[PDB]
């Protein structure tokens, strides 16, 4: 009664995203995972129904064994959540009406995953009850019991879980948050999590790193399994791939969403 009903957020993964970026027409990164279901979204429902908003955000991670020029991951992360729950608190203020969908691949899904965190436990920027469903996409800090597990996932735990006592990572740039306090709270019926077998993200065994090899640590860290989770290879869930689960179950989400 006024504005669109349901704001979907999508939070795009590292070298996904640049600050400079149409929030309502990502095209900067074309190959960006979340674009596979932000787009179709988009099209397939109107204005006054459906706003679908991708986060402008950084979403680097600076490697300080190559000369990047990069942001470090631990600001960038802080970046595009800032960003993000502004983005949620200014729809909120101008439609305290509007209910919300949220989901994120890597990077972003750890920033989408902490939200959810937040929201779930009454820390804010929105009421649990306002949001709808959240998706994670291999999510550094996924836990095994915290939040829905979708599909072949292998058990395991995020790199930011089992690299979390690593105290060089920190100092380095890019802190291992370890697990969320108080989990997903109300929202972890809600909170999906998919991860591939072999994504060492979100699923890191304590053998698949070392200290006395921290090139190749953070390369692991910074980001095939990675790339294609718009295959059917290594992840699928009753006939489509990550990308299509993720989207059939927003798209029918929005369906159901309350009409103010």
Same mark, same amino acid.
């Given at each position: 009664a006024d504005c669109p009903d349901v704001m979907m957020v999508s939070i795009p993964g590292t070298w996904e995203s640049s600050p400079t970026d149409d929030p309502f027409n990502p095209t900067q990164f074309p190959l960006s995972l979340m674009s596979n279901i932000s787009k179709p979204l988009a099209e397939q429902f109107g204005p006054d129904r459906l706003q679908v908003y991708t986060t402008p955000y950084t979403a680097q991670f600076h490697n300080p064994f190559a000369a990047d020029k990069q942001m470090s991951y631990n600001?960038?992360?802080?970046?595009?959540?800032?960003?993000?729950?502004?983005?949620?608190?200014?729809?909120?203020?101008?439609?305290?009406?509007?209910?919300?969908?949220?989901?994120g691949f890597s990077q972003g899904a750890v920033i989408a995953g902490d939200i959810a965190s937040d929201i779930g436990n009454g820390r804010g920027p929105v009421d649990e009850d306002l949001v709808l469903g959240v998706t994670l996409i291999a999510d550094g800090r996924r836990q095994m019991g915290v939040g829905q597990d979708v599909g072949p996932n292998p058990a395991g735990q995020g790199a930011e879980i089992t690299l979390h006592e690593v105290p060089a990572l920190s100092a380095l740039? $890019?802190?291992? *948050?370890?697990?969320?306090?108080?989990?997903? %709270?109300?929202?972890?019926?809600?909170?999906?999590?998919?991860?591939?077998?072999?994504?060492?993200?979100?699923?890191?065994?304590?053998?698949?790193?070392?200290?006395?090899?921290?090139?190749?640590?953070?390369?692991?860290?910074?980001?095939?399994?990675?790339? $294609?989770?718009? *295959?059917?290879?290594?992840?699928?869930?009753? %006939?489509?791939?990550?990308?299509?689960?993720t989207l059939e179950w927003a798209r029918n989400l929005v369906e159901n969403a309350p009409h103010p």
């Open positions: 600001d960038s992360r802080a970046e595009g959540m800032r960003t993000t729950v502004k983005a949620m608190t200014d729809m909120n203020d101008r439609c305290p009406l509007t209910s919300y969908v949220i989901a740039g $890019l802190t291992m *948050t370890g697990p969320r306090p108080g989990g997903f %709270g109300a929202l972890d019926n809600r909170t999906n999590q998919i991860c591939g077998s072999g994504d060492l993200i979100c699923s890191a065994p304590e053998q698949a790193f070392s200290v006395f090899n921290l090139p190749k640590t953070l390369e692991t860290l910074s980001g095939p399994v990675h790339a $294609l989770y718009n *295959t059917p290879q290594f992840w699928v869930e009753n %006939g489509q791939t990550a990308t299509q689960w």
